[PDB]
Design a protein around this ligand. Structure first.
Ligand SMILES: C/C(=C\COP(=O)(O)OP(=O)(O)O)CO
Ligand SMILES: C/C(=C\COP(=O)(O)OP(=O)(O)O)CO
Lengths: 191, 191
């Protein structure tokens, strides 16, 4: 069940060793020293406007992108009451206010808002019903087949899969947090 | 106060999301479908050889181990008249009969026998005197300080702290039940 999940993911997808890129992180984000976790600060840091940095979206990326193959990583979201995670195109508009995070705008993400509302960030947003709140989420990228999927990485249940896409840009792991709370997002070691 | 215990656990220790590993579970144990609970059976299962499995001790482990950091989880023991819980080293002699569960053998555990006799499984065993019987037990690991502690998770009260170890191996949550009875051991998910 969980076991079947682990066997399936290990057979089919390459483990990506994701580390967060402080240079991309909106100034309201604190990336941990080990670059595995990200937290939202109360006050923004005073950081330069280098082209890589998100200036509007409360986002940070992985250091490395994907251009082909099947890849997965897992993110511990624990009890944090707001988070959205997935992948985004390298050429997302990092410097424009109010760009909706949607596949059309180079984002493939899902998560949680207001403690209990699960969504996939489609346009319009898709509401999800998950019998069990995930503590750890498996993100899955099949670049060739154009498929971004999410699983509960502990009990192996399927969370969501985006419609078929035809990727024309490299894809980054992306992480977004809006609220001030205690629990971090953490990229966990993967089998 | 339970309030102080709540604040303390939440400030200092990362909440471990513990799921029982059925491949480790001695064949006389039955792990629930959600792998949050374990019960002792009257008859063993007939299973294929597995290196991970406890052959002698009536034990099951968590799926994940700890190699650094401060971690806690909380176990519902209910009115069950016999149980022992804690952590053990990854390299405990799983396959060997008659190994005493003690710190020298890779185990740091405490619990209940015969309804009313609480013990820490030191060598010798140290008898505990608990003003009230717990129904939920908080297990606390601080890997750097070598500190394994047990608390009454409802009212915050201290149950037992082992002499500080110098851990040189990854640590698993471990769970042992000997006796036949209706109340399972249950891991309460992250609050
Ligand atoms: C302010 C902000 C994001 C909120 O965006 P939205 O208000 O469009 O809502 P959502 O559906 O969650 O994307 C910065 O990332
Ligand atoms: C039979 C058994 C465990 C009990 O071992 P022991 O009989 O040595 O007693 P204890 O002091 O509770 O460890 C299988 O796990």
């Amino acid at each position: 069940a969980g076991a079947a999940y682990h066997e399936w993911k290990m057979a089919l997808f390459k483990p990506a060793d994701v580390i967060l890129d402080p240079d991309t992180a909106n100034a309201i984000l604190l990336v941990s020293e080990d670059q595995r976790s990200v937290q939202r600060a109360e006050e923004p840091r005073d950081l330069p406007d280098n082209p890589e940095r998100f200036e509007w979206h409360y986002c940070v990326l992985g250091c490395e992108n994907f251009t082909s193959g099947r890849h997965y990583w897992e993110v511990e979201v624990g009890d944090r009451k707001e988070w959205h995670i997935g992948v985004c195109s390298k050429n997302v508009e990092r410097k424009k206010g109010w760009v909706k995070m949607t596949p059309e705008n180079g984002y493939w993400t899902m998560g949680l808002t207001d403690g209990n509302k699960y969504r996939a960030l489609t346009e319009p947003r898709t509401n999800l019903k998950l019998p069990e709140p995930p503590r750890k989420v498996g993100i899955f990228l099949d670049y060739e087949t154009g498929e971004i999927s999410f699983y509960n990485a502990t009990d192996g249940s399927h969370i969501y899969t985006f419609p078929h896409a035809s990727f024309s840009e490299p894809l980054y792991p992306v992480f977004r947090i809006l609220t001030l709370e205690p629990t971090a997002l953490t990229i966990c070691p993967i089998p």
